[PDB]
Design a protein around this ligand. Structure first.
Ligand SMILES: CCCCCCCCCCCCCCCC(=O)O
Ligand SMILES: CCCCCCCCCCCCCCCC(=O)O
Ligand SMILES: CCCCCCCCCCCCCCCC(=O)O
Ligand SMILES: CCCCCCCCCCCCCCCC(=O)O
Ligand SMILES: CCCCCCCCCCCCCCCC(=O)O
Ligand SMILES: CCCCCCCCCCCCCCCC(=O)O
Ligand SMILES: CCCCCCCCCCCCCCCC(=O)O
Length: 582
């Protein structure tokens, strides 16, 4: 308790400590070279070991914040490289630390990381495992300055396991590349979710966040009392606040305390927490955040008795509105792990809205009596969309399902740029691949999780380059109306067709030699453009052009000669398709 560095050092172990100190420094000093960070890591590690051997040695009594800032301020090139950030070094703690957070530039001006050739990676890995993994850890951390460090470490170890397994493999590429791709997709998803949660907290306020957190925690911990859930919600809320502010040190301490508590009160919270509650300090909270829903208690009363049939409803509600409403959410959510959180939120809002009306009426009990019937069309709405879309997905498979979305959404919002429609339709396609493989009871939470990020990202793009008032509308609506607003978008009949352009519908033989992935992109790009030029073409008319085109490509990649086939039959395709559409 005398030395904080010594304590984290012993809790973490040297390997973990060295890796975490690297990430921490990378995130603040995003411009310094790797070799300079390695020096810092080594100096701090050496210092930490002095304090382990003698708790009373010099500076071992200093706080982590103070030690960290001291080291940041020793970098002599600070004013030259980071300018204003160097002025933080003139301040005392905690203002100094606060000053550093202010200059932690997210989305910095750095070139995208390029994946080298498989044999190249594997050879660098075998020849120098440490620098290979540490160098890349440094490259990822500096580009993702807000990514919670220990989760970034959890990714790194999965990257190591991917190289260990696959480099020793017969077909390295067939092993490694789909593993690297899955990890890229999960990594980008985790990051986007983290940014999404901090954005929500900021745009919408604490109340909406707590309501979200009550529903989520209640689904996950159905055996827990409302007062345990209420406690966890308060703590969670403080944790996210601190973690969103960007202070790695405070964030990590707040998380550790929370995980420790949950594990000490295990039996009072969930039966499924045993695995997580034995794991080491570094992994506890990440494990807990991931845990499966517990099984719901079997003998649960009808909701109607406490929330519709009770005579004291308004009396219990006016006494403490947010508490009553929160109890409603807890009760509704633990009974429905199959609903999305935002759906549980729409329900709570509806109940609130009717209680605000009914409790002021002559006879309350006979006003709010049929409230549960207004729930029905709110529940069925996302259920039907998921059914319809997963049926369509299973008949067509990922790629053609993607093409169907492309047509649907290009017609709805044709002013959106072609490359953007292709991207979102492809991403939406993936959500179909992931979520439709689940049985009905798990589909809606799955969709919510993927859709919320796809929708956020989208809204962020549109913010940069505005195109439609309809998109702006849905993007700035309550968090709980967002997706319903997008779902309600009509075909744009206001839209004037894009002038025909021959270059857009000319194809060369280079499309026979491109990767399946890039072959798809090319064809999907043309499709969007086709819909933009002929927005009133029927599903049937469009299917005829797509069938011809497919054949047109088949006839000119598998024969003898090719360049003339594409130029010859292509002119015939464009002309025949043009007359078929008027
Ligand atoms: C000069 C001091 C440098 C020390 C660098 C900070 C590294 C310590 C932070 C690691 C604690 C993380 C504990 C995990 C908590 C959790 O998420 O459950
Ligand atoms: C941390 C160790 C990661 C090493 C993996 C190298 C490939 C990362 C490049 C990003 C990508 O896959 O697109
Ligand atoms: C233990 C108290 C937790 C606080 C819970 C407050 C209950 C509010 C439920 C109404 C739903 C509000 C939906 C949030 C976003 C929105 O307003 O659109
Ligand atoms: C950044 C703070 C994750 C915090 C870790 C504390 C673990 C207890 C909370 C477990 C419930 C899940 C909360 C995450 C919400 C979600 O699943 O989307
Ligand atoms: C899964 C299929 C994915 C295909 C994209 C179309 C998604 C339509 C279903 C939206 C359901 C969203 C549930 C979240 C909510 O309650 O609003
Ligand atoms: C630059 C921003 C582009 C604007 C967005 C254009 C693409 C619209 C995508 C709509 C996805 C909505 C998901 C709801 C599922 C549904 O009911 O269709
Ligand atoms: C004016 C009409 C112009 C007609 C040019 C033909 C454009 C059609 C491109 C759609 C591509 C669909 C490919 C579907 C598939 O992969 O099978």
């Amino acid at each position: 308790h005398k030395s904080e560095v010594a304590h984290r050092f012993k809790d973490l172990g040297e390997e973990n400590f060295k890796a975490l100190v690297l990430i921490a420094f990378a995130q603040y000093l995003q411009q310094c070279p790797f070799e300079d960070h390695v020096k810092l890591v080594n100096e701090v590690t050496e210092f930490a070991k002095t304090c382990v051997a003698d708790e009373s040695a010099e500076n071992c009594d200093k706080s982590l914040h103070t030690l960290f800032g001291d080291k940041l301020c020793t970098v002599a090139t600070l004013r030259e490289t980071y300018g204003e950030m160097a002025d933080c070094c003139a301040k005392q703690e905690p203002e100094r630390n606060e000053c550093f957070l202010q200059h932690k530039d997210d989305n910095p001006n750095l070139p995208r990381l390029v994946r080298p050739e498989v044999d190249v990676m594997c050879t660098a890995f075998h020849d120098n495992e440490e620098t290979f993994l540490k160098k890349y850890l440094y490259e990822i951390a500096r580009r993702h300055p807000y990514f919670y460090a220990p989760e970034l470490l959890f990714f790194a170890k999965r990257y190591k396991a991917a190289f260990t397994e696959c480099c020793q493999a017969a077909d390295k590429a067939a092993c490694l590349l789909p593993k690297l791709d899955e990890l890229r997709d999960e990594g980008k998803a985790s990051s986007a979710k983290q940014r999404l949660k901090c954005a929500s907290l900021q745009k919408f306020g604490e109340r909406a966040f707590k309501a979200w957190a009550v529903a989520r925690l209640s689904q996950r911990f159905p055996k827990a009392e409302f007062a345990e859930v209420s406690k966890l919600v308060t703590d969670l809320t403080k944790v996210h606040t601190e973690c969103c502010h960007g202070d790695l040190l405070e964030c990590a301490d707040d998380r550790a305390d929370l995980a420790k508590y949950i594990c000490e009160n295990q039996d009072s919270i969930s039966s499924k927490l045993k695995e997580c509650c034995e794991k080491p300090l570094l992994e506890k909270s990440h494990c807990i955040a991931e845990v499966e829903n517990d099984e719901m208690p079997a003998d649960l009363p009808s909701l109607a008795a406490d929330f519709v049939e009770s005579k004291d409803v308004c009396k219990n509600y006016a006494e403490a509105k947010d508490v009553f409403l929160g109890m409603f959410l807890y009760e509704y959510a633990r009974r429905h792990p199959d609903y999305s959180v935002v759906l549980l939120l729409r329900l709570a809002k509806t109940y609130e809205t009717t209680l605000e009306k009914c409790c002021a009426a002559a006879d309350p009990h006979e006003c709010y009596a049929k409230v549960f019937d207004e729930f029905k069309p709110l529940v069925e709405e996302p259920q039907n969309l998921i059914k319809q879309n997963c049926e369509l997905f299973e008949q067509l498979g990922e790629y053609k399902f993607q093409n169907a979305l492309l047509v649907r959404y290009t017609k709805k919002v044709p002013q959106v740029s072609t490359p953007t429609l292709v991207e979102v339709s492809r991403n939406l396609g993936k959500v179909g691949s992931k979520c439709c493989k689940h049985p009905e009871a798990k589909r809606m939470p799955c969709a919510e999780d993927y859709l919320s990020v796809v929708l956020n990202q989208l809204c962020v793009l549109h913010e940069k380059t505005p195109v439609s008032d309809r998109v702006t509308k849905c993007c700035t609506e309550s968090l709980v109306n967002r997706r319903p607003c997008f779902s309600a978008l009509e075909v744009d009949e206001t839209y004037v067709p894009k002038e025909f352009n021959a270059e857009t519908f000319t194809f060369h033989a280079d499309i026979c030699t491109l990767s399946e992935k890039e072959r798809q992109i090319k064809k999907q790009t043309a499709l969007v453009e086709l819909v933009k030029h002929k927005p009133k073409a029927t599903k049937e008319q469009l299917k005829a052009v797509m069938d011809d085109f497919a054949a047109f490509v088949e006839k000119c990649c598998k024969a003898d000669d090719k360049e003339t086939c594409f130029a010859e039959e292509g002119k015939k395709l464009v002309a025949a398709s043009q007359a078929a559409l008027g």
